[model samples]
Target: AVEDFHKYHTALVVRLAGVPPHERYERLDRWITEQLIYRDEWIDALAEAAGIFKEALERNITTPEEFNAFLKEKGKRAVDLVATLTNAYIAVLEGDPEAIARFLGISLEEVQEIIDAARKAVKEGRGASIGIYTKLRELEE
Candidate 1:
């Protein structure tokens, strides 16, 4: 599934290259927004990966190999972070407290804290699923 994101990013670069230079970035923005809208429920995870892809494109890293190398060099932490958020989302949606604890490797208290934060964030109109896990990571440390 992670590789799927990489492949999509690679394809985006290739597609953008074929378009006129002046329209490439507009296309990129349009494409990214379109792709992200489909994953509305997973906004945070999608946003994180989108940010990574955008950064790579900004730096002229076009090929998938270059993107992979960038990941290997400096994106591993980001990859892991998004994975954690993804898993946490699944666990919560599945209503499995045990799975949440296991997935996050945290105690019951920590899991509850995360759930509370996520709920409050949603209520406060902060996008439905944005930054909950990032908040968890902060509280975790």
Candidate 2:
């Protein structure tokens, strides 16, 4: 379990260095879109739990058990996002058009476009590893 945890964190770090802004945005767009349609209940439950945690903390009633549970559940969402982004990055690196298409929810040509944009962003020193939650943060700000 400890080794798996370390590997997961290492993979996320490598993925952050390797993934680009636009590709991240594209993957997150698809994730958000699909969740809005097919997984609304799960998403809503998380949101509700998060709200409860936040309100409890504000009221000074959040225990360590509550905080730990919140972290575990929230980490699942973070892990899912990281897995999607990292898988997409690996697909592009391997030059597997079929894997790329399946990961990005688009045609092979569109996947290539995303790859090109990621490369350009890297070259221009604009590469960012922003995920869905970060995009939502941008909107909130």
Candidate 3:
């Protein structure tokens, strides 16, 4: 499951090429990282819950009632992070930075800070390879 998820995500990254306006593309790029990649609270909780479920099952205490209860409580928080991402994309299409920030529960300055960092990085050094940066530079056209 994890490998499949990673491969799917990598394909998604590569597919960003089809998006117009690098800034908007970059926003989605950053959104994926900030809202999904970097945040680990949900991941940790899921991990802990899975561990408990596994241990219990191994001990031969795999009751349906217990499993359902565990899923109901622990799984909801994990699902909430996904909801946050869904809402962010809607805000992005509307071009509402404030709505996006609110959905992510982060500050507007924080988003701008990341944009500045990416700008500096791109300015300080070109893209990974000549082919890539050459194409990126053409974006100005």
Instruction: Estimate the Cα RMSD of every predicted model relative to the unseen true structure.
Output: 15.7, 13.2, 16.0
Local distance difference test, each candidate: 0.48, 0.40, 0.38
Query: Following a full C-alpha superposition, what root-mean-square deviation does model 1 have from the true structure?
Result: 15.7
lDDT tens readout by residue for model 3, 1-141 = 322332332233234223243343343434443444334653453344334434334442233334335444557853343334334333342355575556445577654443443344334331111122223334334
Candidate of highest lDDT: 1
lDDT (10s digit) by residue, model 1, range 107-126: 77776776676566444433
Model 2 alpha-carbon drift over 4 Å, by segment:
1-91, 128-141
Compose the digit string of candidate 2's lDDT tens values, residues 19-119. 33334444444443333334544445444433433433444322333433444566786434433433444343335556546664567666555555555
**Candidate that scores best on TM-score:** 1
Worst 10-residue lDDT window for candidate 3 reads 125-134
lDDT of 3 at 1: 31
Model 2, position 80, has a per-residue lDDT of 48
Q: State which candidate, 2 or 3, has the greater TM-score.
A: 2
Error of 1 at 7 (Å): 10
